[PDB]
Amino acid sequence: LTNAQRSGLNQIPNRRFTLWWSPTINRANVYVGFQVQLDLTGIFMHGKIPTLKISLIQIFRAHLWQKIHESIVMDLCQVFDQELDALEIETVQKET
Amino acid sequence: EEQPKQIIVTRKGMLDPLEVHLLDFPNIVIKGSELQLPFQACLKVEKF
Amino acid sequence: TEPYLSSQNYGELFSNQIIWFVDDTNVYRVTIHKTFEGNLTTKPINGA
Amino acid sequence: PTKVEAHVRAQMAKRQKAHEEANAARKLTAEQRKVKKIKKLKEDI
Amino acid sequence: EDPSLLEWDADDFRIFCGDLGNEVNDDILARAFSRFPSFLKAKVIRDKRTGKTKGYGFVSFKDPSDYVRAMREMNGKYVGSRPIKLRKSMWKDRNLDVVRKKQKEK
Amino acid sequence: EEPIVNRGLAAALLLCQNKGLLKEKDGYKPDVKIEYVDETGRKLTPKEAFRQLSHRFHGKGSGKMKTERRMKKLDEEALLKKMLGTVALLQEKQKPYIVL
RNA sequence: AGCUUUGCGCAGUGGCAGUAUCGUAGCCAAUGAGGUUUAUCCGAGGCGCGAUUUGCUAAUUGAAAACUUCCCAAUAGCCGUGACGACUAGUCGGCAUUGGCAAUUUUUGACAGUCUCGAGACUGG
């Protein structure tokens, strides 16, 4: 592989390091906020940490934030349909 | 239909290569054995 | 790591799930044959 | 086990039969041997 | 059984081009393959209710001698804005996968 | 070694265990089961439960070929688990070492 | 006419395939490559550089692995009751749906095992 590809293959462990220490590096005490919310994701990124931006985008790729919220909403309404009458509920309504 | 889903190795130094060579079949279970079975007795019978 | 096949877990060998035993001990075997004057040979023989 | 290599037995019979077909044509049938033995023996006097 | 596959066939061979740019290529593909083998029919699969291109397209050639040179020359060739990828057409319809299922058990 | 004894159940339990086949609130226990199933009733793997969720999310399911592989995989499980030794015995009795 | 030798080509069985198989356009090479054995003898490629098509199928991740979907509404036995109707408060037929249908005469199981030469016997401790 090319010298640039060898460079990127050696920056891979910096990616897993940055993603590992993300909750204490990507806080607001560490980098004073120019809080940029990640796109289609509820993560704010204090400070331009582009390695962390790539890792957190690759985690939350393909609209995983909305899919997590949708799955939690639909599973909770599954719970509320399982327990409809014994809480005195007429119906549930998955809001638009 | 005739492939197993559980494979038991008598000698303990084979389940770790069996993990590698059977990643095309993740449906199968590769466990070791505490009971060893004398299949060298199969060698001792004249036919085999 | 799966529970190794003990003498209290071997009863699971005979349910509907098809199980194999792989005994690889006898794969590589030799015979060690002497003539007295000269030297000593070791013939690798076939295994199973 | 007899069924699958029975199929492949018919197919290797087809394969050996095709080898014998390619030897069956291009064979110097009965008299092409005769004309080639003649052009071997009859020189250009 | 879609009633549109019957506009190319005259026992002619179809090349399958995919990875095509969905913003264009409606007749660009015809324009590019037109020099080869005299007026022909080359479609692009643009799905309905959307007007969006699904990628792939089918160019039907008159000869399988013409086909080999066309395929070898225009493989990855810049067409509209994406390099086309070329394979042979499936057309796995009913009258051939019935034969395939009958060839399975034999 | 245990027979299912006629006039007896407990030997079948000793068989299957051997084979390993085993505000003023209301005031109550809400037994929440959170379960993912497909239309056939099968308990669904979380990877493919997320796959069903994401197919319904994106509105675009699988292609034809991956559905062929997936459906043929499910009836491979169905044909496997609904069950050549007798054929081996009949081939051996026709002549003992059927070498492949 | 038959047998047969050598070289080449085709196909087939089998075997081998990173101390294997090649390319070489760079150089050298029978006007001699390369030689510790036998050297007034042997005789073929050598050094470097550079490589290791095609079809089919499986499996994985991925939302999507490339050949022209989900959801809602409705339709697809008996005992009672309500009307309609028929026949003399009673009886009968069809229709309809607002409770029920595991406790001896039926539809929620006296069944299961054993033995003897289509027929019987034993047990359920």
PDB file of N, CA and C in Angstrom, chain E residues 32-80:
ATOM      1  N   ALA E  32     -23.642   7.461 -26.697  1.00  0.00           N
ATOM      2  CA  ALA E  32     -22.306   6.871 -26.596  1.00  0.00           C
ATOM      3  C   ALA E  32     -22.207   5.530 -27.322  1.00  0.00           C
ATOM      4  N   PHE E  33     -23.220   4.680 -27.237  1.00  0.00           N
ATOM      5  CA  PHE E  33     -23.113   3.371 -27.885  1.00  0.00           C
ATOM      6  C   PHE E  33     -23.550   3.376 -29.348  1.00  0.00           C
ATOM      7  N   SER E  34     -24.142   4.480 -29.789  1.00  0.00           N
ATOM      8  CA  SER E  34     -24.681   4.635 -31.139  1.00  0.00           C
ATOM      9  C   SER E  34     -23.678   4.446 -32.272  1.00  0.00           C
ATOM     10  N   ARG E  35     -22.439   4.882 -32.085  1.00  0.00           N
ATOM     11  CA  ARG E  35     -21.460   4.724 -33.149  1.00  0.00           C
ATOM     12  C   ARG E  35     -21.336   3.237 -33.455  1.00  0.00           C
ATOM     13  N   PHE E  36     -21.313   2.417 -32.410  1.00  0.00           N
ATOM     14  CA  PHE E  36     -21.235   0.971 -32.573  1.00  0.00           C
ATOM     15  C   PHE E  36     -22.576   0.426 -33.061  1.00  0.00           C
ATOM     16  N   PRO E  37     -22.539  -0.607 -33.898  1.00  0.00           N
ATOM     17  CA  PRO E  37     -23.767  -1.224 -34.415  1.00  0.00           C
ATOM     18  C   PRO E  37     -25.129  -0.589 -34.814  1.00  0.00           C
ATOM     19  N   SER E  38     -25.191   0.277 -35.835  1.00  0.00           N
ATOM     20  CA  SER E  38     -26.414   0.947 -36.385  1.00  0.00           C
ATOM     21  C   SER E  38     -27.726   1.081 -35.568  1.00  0.00           C
ATOM     22  N   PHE E  39     -28.320   2.272 -35.590  1.00  0.00           N
ATOM     23  CA  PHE E  39     -29.505   2.511 -34.776  1.00  0.00           C
ATOM     24  C   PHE E  39     -29.863   1.249 -33.996  1.00  0.00           C
ATOM     25  N   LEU E  40     -30.000   1.401 -32.678  1.00  0.00           N
ATOM     26  CA  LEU E  40     -30.369   0.331 -31.757  1.00  0.00           C
ATOM     27  C   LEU E  40     -31.241   0.919 -30.659  1.00  0.00           C
ATOM     28  N   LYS E  41     -31.675   0.063 -29.739  1.00  0.00           N
ATOM     29  CA  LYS E  41     -32.519   0.473 -28.625  1.00  0.00           C
ATOM     30  C   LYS E  41     -31.737   0.302 -27.330  1.00  0.00           C
ATOM     31  N   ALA E  42     -31.530   1.402 -26.609  1.00  0.00           N
ATOM     32  CA  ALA E  42     -30.823   1.384 -25.332  1.00  0.00           C
ATOM     33  C   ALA E  42     -31.625   2.170 -24.304  1.00  0.00           C
ATOM     34  N   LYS E  43     -32.128   1.477 -23.292  1.00  0.00           N
ATOM     35  CA  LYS E  43     -32.920   2.062 -22.223  1.00  0.00           C
ATOM     36  C   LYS E  43     -32.093   2.285 -20.968  1.00  0.00           C
ATOM     37  N   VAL E  44     -32.664   3.075 -20.067  1.00  0.00           N
ATOM     38  CA  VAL E  44     -32.090   3.420 -18.775  1.00  0.00           C
ATOM     39  C   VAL E  44     -33.229   3.212 -17.795  1.00  0.00           C
ATOM     40  N   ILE E  45     -32.964   2.543 -16.681  1.00  0.00           N
ATOM     41  CA  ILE E  45     -34.056   2.319 -15.750  1.00  0.00           C
ATOM     42  C   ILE E  45     -34.285   3.468 -14.782  1.00  0.00           C
ATOM     43  N   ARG E  46     -35.262   4.290 -15.127  1.00  0.00           N
ATOM     44  CA  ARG E  46     -35.684   5.452 -14.359  1.00  0.00           C
ATOM     45  C   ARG E  46     -37.044   5.089 -13.774  1.00  0.00           C
ATOM     46  N   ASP E  47     -37.118   4.910 -12.455  1.00  0.00           N
ATOM     47  CA  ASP E  47     -38.341   4.355 -11.889  1.00  0.00           C
ATOM     48  C   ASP E  47     -39.453   5.405 -11.837  1.00  0.00           C
ATOM     49  N   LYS E  48     -40.693   4.925 -11.859  1.00  0.00           N
ATOM     50  CA  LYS E  48     -41.839   5.815 -11.916  1.00  0.00           C
ATOM     51  C   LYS E  48     -42.261   6.270 -10.524  1.00  0.00           C
ATOM     52  N   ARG E  49     -43.129   7.297 -10.522  1.00  0.00           N
ATOM     53  CA  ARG E  49     -43.668   8.093  -9.410  1.00  0.00           C
ATOM     54  C   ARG E  49     -42.604   9.037  -8.845  1.00  0.00           C
ATOM     55  N   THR E  50     -41.369   8.910  -9.304  1.00  0.00           N
ATOM     56  CA  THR E  50     -40.223   9.679  -8.838  1.00  0.00           C
ATOM     57  C   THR E  50     -39.501  10.395  -9.965  1.00  0.00           C
ATOM     58  N   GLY E  51     -39.333   9.748 -11.115  1.00  0.00           N
ATOM     59  CA  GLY E  51     -38.493  10.297 -12.158  1.00  0.00           C
ATOM     60  C   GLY E  51     -37.015  10.139 -11.903  1.00  0.00           C
ATOM     61  N   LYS E  52     -36.636   9.364 -10.891  1.00  0.00           N
ATOM     62  CA  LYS E  52     -35.246   9.148 -10.520  1.00  0.00           C
ATOM     63  C   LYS E  52     -34.694   7.918 -11.227  1.00  0.00           C
ATOM     64  N   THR E  53     -33.414   7.973 -11.576  1.00  0.00           N
ATOM     65  CA  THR E  53     -32.772   6.853 -12.244  1.00  0.00           C
ATOM     66  C   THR E  53     -32.278   5.849 -11.214  1.00  0.00           C
ATOM     67  N   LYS E  54     -32.617   4.578 -11.419  1.00  0.00           N
ATOM     68  CA  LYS E  54     -32.233   3.506 -10.516  1.00  0.00           C
ATOM     69  C   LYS E  54     -30.797   3.034 -10.709  1.00  0.00           C
ATOM     70  N   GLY E  55     -30.002   3.707 -11.532  1.00  0.00           N
ATOM     71  CA  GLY E  55     -28.668   3.219 -11.793  1.00  0.00           C
ATOM     72  C   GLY E  55     -28.507   2.560 -13.145  1.00  0.00           C
ATOM     73  N   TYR E  56     -28.619   1.239 -13.145  1.00  0.00           N
ATOM     74  CA  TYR E  56     -28.473   0.361 -14.299  1.00  0.00           C
ATOM     75  C   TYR E  56     -29.212   0.709 -15.592  1.00  0.00           C
ATOM     76  N   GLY E  57     -28.706   0.180 -16.706  1.00  0.00           N
ATOM     77  CA  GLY E  57     -29.300   0.373 -18.023  1.00  0.00           C
ATOM     78  C   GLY E  57     -28.981  -0.810 -18.914  1.00  0.00           C
ATOM     79  N   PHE E  58     -29.862  -1.068 -19.884  1.00  0.00           N
ATOM     80  CA  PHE E  58     -29.692  -2.163 -20.839  1.00  0.00           C
ATOM     81  C   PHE E  58     -29.527  -1.743 -22.295  1.00  0.00           C
ATOM     82  N   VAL E  59     -28.351  -1.992 -22.857  1.00  0.00           N
ATOM     83  CA  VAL E  59     -28.022  -1.693 -24.251  1.00  0.00           C
ATOM     84  C   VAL E  59     -28.051  -3.003 -25.044  1.00  0.00           C
ATOM     85  N   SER E  60     -28.978  -3.173 -25.985  1.00  0.00           N
ATOM     86  CA  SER E  60     -29.107  -4.432 -26.731  1.00  0.00           C
ATOM     87  C   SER E  60     -28.369  -4.364 -28.071  1.00  0.00           C
ATOM     88  N   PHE E  61     -27.311  -5.174 -28.222  1.00  0.00           N
ATOM     89  CA  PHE E  61     -26.500  -5.185 -29.438  1.00  0.00           C
ATOM     90  C   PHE E  61     -26.914  -6.274 -30.428  1.00  0.00           C
ATOM     91  N   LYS E  62     -26.757  -5.958 -31.723  1.00  0.00           N
ATOM     92  CA  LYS E  62     -27.059  -6.903 -32.800  1.00  0.00           C
ATOM     93  C   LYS E  62     -26.136  -8.123 -32.862  1.00  0.00           C
ATOM     94  N   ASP E  63     -24.844  -7.962 -32.572  1.00  0.00           N
ATOM     95  CA  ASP E  63     -23.905  -9.085 -32.646  1.00  0.00           C
ATOM     96  C   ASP E  63     -23.180  -9.394 -31.345  1.00  0.00           C
ATOM     97  N   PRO E  64     -22.952 -10.668 -31.020  1.00  0.00           N
ATOM     98  CA  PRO E  64     -21.962 -11.013 -29.986  1.00  0.00           C
ATOM     99  C   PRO E  64     -20.497 -10.929 -30.421  1.00  0.00           C
ATOM    100  N   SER E  65     -20.216 -10.519 -31.662  1.00  0.00           N
ATOM    101  CA  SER E  65     -18.871 -10.071 -32.028  1.00  0.00           C
ATOM    102  C   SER E  65     -18.717  -8.591 -31.714  1.00  0.00           C
ATOM    103  N   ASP E  66     -19.788  -7.851 -31.984  1.00  0.00           N
ATOM    104  CA  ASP E  66     -19.884  -6.425 -31.703  1.00  0.00           C
ATOM    105  C   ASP E  66     -19.806  -6.205 -30.200  1.00  0.00           C
ATOM    106  N   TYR E  67     -20.508  -7.066 -29.470  1.00  0.00           N
ATOM    107  CA  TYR E  67     -20.586  -7.052 -28.018  1.00  0.00           C
ATOM    108  C   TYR E  67     -19.234  -7.138 -27.327  1.00  0.00           C
ATOM    109  N   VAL E  68     -18.367  -8.058 -27.751  1.00  0.00           N
ATOM    110  CA  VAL E  68     -17.059  -8.207 -27.106  1.00  0.00           C
ATOM    111  C   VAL E  68     -16.209  -6.946 -27.248  1.00  0.00           C
ATOM    112  N   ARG E  69     -16.148  -6.372 -28.454  1.00  0.00           N
ATOM    113  CA  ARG E  69     -15.366  -5.150 -28.639  1.00  0.00           C
ATOM    114  C   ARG E  69     -15.970  -3.974 -27.882  1.00  0.00           C
ATOM    115  N   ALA E  70     -17.302  -3.851 -27.906  1.00  0.00           N
ATOM    116  CA  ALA E  70     -17.977  -2.783 -27.174  1.00  0.00           C
ATOM    117  C   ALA E  70     -17.718  -2.889 -25.675  1.00  0.00           C
ATOM    118  N   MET E  71     -17.900  -4.091 -25.116  1.00  0.00           N
ATOM    119  CA  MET E  71     -17.677  -4.333 -23.694  1.00  0.00           C
ATOM    120  C   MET E  71     -16.242  -4.017 -23.292  1.00  0.00           C
ATOM    121  N   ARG E  72     -15.265  -4.590 -24.008  1.00  0.00           N
ATOM    122  CA  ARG E  72     -13.858  -4.347 -23.687  1.00  0.00           C
ATOM    123  C   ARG E  72     -13.467  -2.879 -23.824  1.00  0.00           C
ATOM    124  N   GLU E  73     -14.003  -2.178 -24.828  1.00  0.00           N
ATOM    125  CA  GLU E  73     -13.595  -0.786 -24.976  1.00  0.00           C
ATOM    126  C   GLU E  73     -14.291   0.151 -23.993  1.00  0.00           C
ATOM    127  N   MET E  74     -15.595  -0.005 -23.773  1.00  0.00           N
ATOM    128  CA  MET E  74     -16.326   0.908 -22.900  1.00  0.00           C
ATOM    129  C   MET E  74     -16.475   0.389 -21.475  1.00  0.00           C
ATOM    130  N   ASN E  75     -15.526  -0.387 -20.976  1.00  0.00           N
ATOM    131  CA  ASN E  75     -15.585  -0.772 -19.575  1.00  0.00           C
ATOM    132  C   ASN E  75     -14.895   0.299 -18.743  1.00  0.00           C
ATOM    133  N   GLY E  76     -15.645   0.917 -17.838  1.00  0.00           N
ATOM    134  CA  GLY E  76     -15.184   2.028 -17.030  1.00  0.00           C
ATOM    135  C   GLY E  76     -15.053   3.347 -17.756  1.00  0.00           C
ATOM    136  N   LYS E  77     -15.393   3.391 -19.040  1.00  0.00           N
ATOM    137  CA  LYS E  77     -15.303   4.599 -19.848  1.00  0.00           C
ATOM    138  C   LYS E  77     -16.228   5.683 -19.307  1.00  0.00           C
ATOM    139  N   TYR E  78     -15.687   6.885 -19.137  1.00  0.00           N
ATOM    140  CA  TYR E  78     -16.463   8.026 -18.659  1.00  0.00           C
ATOM    141  C   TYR E  78     -17.636   8.350 -19.573  1.00  0.00           C
ATOM    142  N   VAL E  79     -18.822   8.165 -19.004  1.00  0.00           N
ATOM    143  CA  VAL E  79     -20.139   8.321 -19.604  1.00  0.00           C
ATOM    144  C   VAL E  79     -20.915   9.120 -18.577  1.00  0.00           C
ATOM    145  N   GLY E  80     -21.450  10.269 -19.003  1.00  0.00           N
ATOM    146  CA  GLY E  80     -22.129  11.231 -18.148  1.00  0.00           C
ATOM    147  C   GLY E  80     -21.211  11.561 -16.987  1.00  0.00           C
TER     148      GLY E  80
END
